[PDB]
Point group: C3
Chain length 360, copies 3
Amino acid sequence: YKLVCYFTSWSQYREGVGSFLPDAIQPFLCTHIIYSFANISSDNMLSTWEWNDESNYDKLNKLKTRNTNLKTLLSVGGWKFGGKRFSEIASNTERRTAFVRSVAPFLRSYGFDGLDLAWLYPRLRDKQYFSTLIKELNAEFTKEVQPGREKLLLSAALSAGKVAIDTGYDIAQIAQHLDFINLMTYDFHGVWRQITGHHSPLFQGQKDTRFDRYSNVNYAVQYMIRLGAQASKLLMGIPTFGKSFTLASSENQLGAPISGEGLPGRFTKEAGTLAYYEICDFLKGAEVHRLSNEKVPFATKGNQWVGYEDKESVKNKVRFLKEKKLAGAMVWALDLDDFQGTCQPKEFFPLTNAIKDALA
Amino acid sequence: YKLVCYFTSWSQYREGVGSFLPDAIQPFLCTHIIYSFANISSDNMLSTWEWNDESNYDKLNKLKTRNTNLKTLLSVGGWKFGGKRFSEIASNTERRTAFVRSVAPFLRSYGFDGLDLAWLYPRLRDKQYFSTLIKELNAEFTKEVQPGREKLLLSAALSAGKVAIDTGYDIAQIAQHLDFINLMTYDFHGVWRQITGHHSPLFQGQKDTRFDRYSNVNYAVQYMIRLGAQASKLLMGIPTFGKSFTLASSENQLGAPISGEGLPGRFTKEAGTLAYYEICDFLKGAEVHRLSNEKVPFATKGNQWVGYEDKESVKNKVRFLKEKKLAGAMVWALDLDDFQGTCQPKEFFPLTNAIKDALA
Amino acid sequence: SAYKLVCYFTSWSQYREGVGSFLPDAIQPFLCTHIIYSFANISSDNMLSTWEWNDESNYDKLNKLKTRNTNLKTLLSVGGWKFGGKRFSEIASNTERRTAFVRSVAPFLRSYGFDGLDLAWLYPRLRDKQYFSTLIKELNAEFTKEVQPGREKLLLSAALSAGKVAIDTGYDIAQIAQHLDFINLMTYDFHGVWRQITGHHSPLFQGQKDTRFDRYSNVNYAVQYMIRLGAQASKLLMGIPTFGKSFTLASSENQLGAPISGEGLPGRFTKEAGTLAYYEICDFLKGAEVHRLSNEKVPFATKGNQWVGYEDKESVKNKVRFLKEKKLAGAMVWALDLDDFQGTCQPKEFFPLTNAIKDALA
């Protein structure tokens, strides 16, 4: 089984104990570590994003001297990068070719073992170009490998939303040219629903609305397989973060009315999002409810409501992905796990280690 | 009568059924269609904003082959663009001249019939420069007529807020050089009021302050006329969108207390704003109330409250603009109308078509 | 002793609607001893530069004040929150880039008639601490090398956090205090919305403590802590805000520590949820209840589900009395554009809060 772990560059800028650097990662935690995100220069070439990315690349590859089988990948794109730019590059043969050719020298220069594609998200007019890009990256990596080196890995972060998949992805085509698929099986329940909901339920709940039937881990996985992704290619995404809501009234059950995003956490400073280490604090004095159908916990206290992942639900999701014979787990993200052991004494990365243990 | 219809470039990026492209426009819906927004390059020259604006210019002008009387305009500026850049350009003779000269070749190259000025918004130090810019554009369009030409049209989006008008506009001066004025008679009630209010009331309601009397369609129209805008130049802005609030308590009347913006819609994803196609969804299970004085509806459901436009209120506003002998209606925006017939089986553009029918 | 009244104002305040628009020529020339312009940028060539296209003309409106008060000092503040820490980390940690900046400072200031530089690195983290020190030292040295007959040495100040953790993380206080003419202590904005309860953002002292409110987040602790860490009282300026921090209440409970549903509703002119200028607070108080904290020595105001902790004349005067007892160099004010600079609150009372501070310093 693969355990593919994302972490973010911007997590370094959080205050105090929230600041995350790659040298805080246990070298044997993950099989693959992905650095998010790289940019693309105006000359259409893969490049760093922050002024100091090189030094973090160095801190990341120094890990591989302590675990020589550890693989690192660089993720290009991300939400901030936007779809517009990828549409601009991929749909133009010269811009796309400049990028494809720019990828491998960069990765080798900084000691990376592969590229992760984070085009969030291709629209209908981009679908085929998306395919082409992947093919052309795969071809290029095939043409680039030499003796003494291992062929560059190619992965892609794909949406777990049915509509996004139908709109953007030619699944059967791209799955053949990707070493693995990072399935983003989380963040399923936006605040536009106007009710509380868990953002990463394993199965559908008691309700059977249009939005309810598709927005769960099981449907996304089975749908990806039905569309021609190989189970051996699929990595099931598991979040370390919770999605939160401010309650409109005393009702705090699943489906209760909300007045907006949850109050931001002290360190992540993003309304509606909580890192696991912020959730640990939140749980003191809170009610934890375990969803029978969805197999995941939410916790509530005062007018705050957060759906999240703990050790148990993470282990159960690993059991699910094993029954489905998936390639393993993908984790977003290490910097949102309790990486410093704040929650429990000397338990570093409790969620990711729980995933690793359940995979063994 | 003119029916001048705005649509936005960024509406193309909305998910699913929300994605809007100009080829979805019925060619006989509007007399004029305005593309928002164009940018200005660092060399002070009119330019595209998105990498693919050119292809949407094509989608838009190919409409004129199906309705040869249709006029298109390109709107430069917009809220994101900001006032600063316009202050920098307009107050400097060289930069302003570079822009002014750049406009006509650009518009002709892409098949546009005119330019719309969307300086949101000029402050006191800009007022005269604003005038100058308009004059110099008009002069240039006067100088540019050819054999197979119609003179380029020049319009401007002007605020309907009294203070913005007194601060930024020399109305009597600029009205002489503008073919029409797109009066932004909507978005009158910011969340700073701390109570619910309709964002486009036709007349003032029962409540009185100082800016209660000014913040309605009637006052803005009559004020623009009193300041020397010609009724034949004034287009009365009519919104296809609602402005929404989250209610602080069970009180849901006009003037009820709020805790913030309304919850965002699924497709528009902007707290406080709902497209008409999202409002149709919202009305299912909601109570609709029609304001007697203000002549417009608001709807309430749970802790959500939205003031909006429907067929009836839109028709009544057309009747109003006819009594005042205005040049016609301006619509913001086509992408916020139910352009795909989600509300009622293939009734495309119900609000805009209601306006068109009411002009006859 | 003699006291400094150091007053910040912001460049972006000019862009606010209507009566909220602020330009430096609205400043009374004798209000303040020092006026600080926020913020300057740093060009990609690592050189001090303007931020807005029209900064030069506002520099002129600002120095035109000094002809009417010839003892008035102006400083240009570089950095700010929008500027971010990343850029300062990039510049300060590299000897070539840092030297280019240091050398660029003085010619710029002289070109535009400024009497000094204010450093607004918000905020240096642990790996930046020493580089921060070096930068300050190297600026001071450079200003020392730049003085000639007929001119007075450039002033060097720094905006420093009043938060304990930020201070421990970023600042070598005893070292940098020796190379700074004064420290602008940011003794405000103490209570972020992440607390999930109401709190005053600039309490003078700790209140009747429950576990939710820490010991550190008040003016007294920050001042005494800075002194304990080797800042000289004669170097410390105690920051006093003209703005309030606001919350939307989750329920009818409206006292200190009450539950909230988010930031306060934005003001009409400042347009920033959670923040209200004093002139917006004046309007807000109409129909509101004003509550005065006994221990914290500051007011909060309540109306409907809105809750705002702020400063009025009384609390500002009392804070000046406090800073005098501690023998501080004087007061720092953030910010003039957030004071009632046009006299909206009371007829012909321009800058009521800052003038209250000035009067109390005399």
